[PDB]
């Protein structure tokens, strides 16, 4: 009747996609390690560092490149105990749109917060996630399929977006990225499966 579904830490805990406005740029970077960064350095990326200095965009305009200069150290990302932090190493603030964050904190849905330099933020609380997942399960499929939205987090360097904002959508921001928490997604799949037997 009630079969237990456990969260299982993936090999690559998340994948990152870079964007300049509405144009996706570069290839999809996959996170394998516990602590890495997404910067704008002109060095060849690796398992531990997703550099953007080397990404070309034939349609890149002055605004994009100018901003691309300020990513710098970028953001350090950490995965631990299914918890995910984002530390703004950059000298320019970063902005995050995490459904999980907006869930707690009771913020309006879709909000984007600012993670200024020297600061970090737990963009994903796997526990809080399990709690919802738990609760959700008991509301059927749709309820659960809804949490998939939480496994996707978007972040933009230097410039932010959102309501109260000049730039209303992520797509209007100079330099941003989208991550996908595989841990949660896998776990969300497994769950639906067990519900879909």
């Amino acid at each position: 009747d009630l079969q237990p579904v456990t969260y299982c830490e993936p090999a690559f805990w998340c994948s990152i996609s870079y964007y300049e406005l509405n144009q996706r740029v570069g290839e999809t970077f996959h996170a394998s390690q516990p602590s890495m960064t997404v910067d704008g350095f002109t060095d060849p990326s690796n398992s531990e560092r997703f550099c953007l200095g080397l990404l070309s965009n034939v349609n890149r305009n002055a605004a994009v490149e100018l901003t691309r200069r300020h990513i710098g150290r970028g953001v350090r990302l950490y995965y631990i105990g299914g918890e995910v932090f984002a530390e703004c190493l950059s000298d320019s603030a970063i902005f995050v749109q995490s459904p999980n964050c907006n869930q707690r904190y009771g913020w309006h849905p879709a909000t984007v917060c600012k993670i200024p330099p020297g600061c970090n933020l737990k963009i994903f609380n796997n526990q809080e996630f399990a709690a919802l997942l738990a609760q959700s399960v008991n509301q059927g499929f749709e309820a659960v399929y809804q949490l998939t939205r939480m496994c996707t987090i978007r972040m933009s360097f230097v410039k932010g977006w959102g309501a109260e904002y000049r730039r209303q959508t992520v797509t209007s921001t100079p330099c941003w990225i989208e991550l996908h928490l595989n841990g949660p997604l896998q776990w969300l799949d497994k769950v639906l499966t067990q519900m879909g037997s």
């Binding site: 969260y7 105990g81 904190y105 917060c113 200024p116 970090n120 933020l121 738990a134």
Partner: protein, 38 residues
């Protein structure tokens, strides 16, 4: 709940690692949820 306009009310200068400790996130095995198979 903290104001989304004041990072200070929700961010931290405490190393992420140092945080995950004083909350038992590492020692914490992966969570489980019971799901009705239907």
């Amino acid at each position: 709940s903290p104001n989304p306009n004041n990072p200070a009310e929700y961010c931290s200068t405490i190393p992420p690692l140092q945080q995950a400790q004083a909350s038992g996130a590492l020692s914490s095995p992966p969570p489980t949820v019971m799901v009705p198979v239907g």
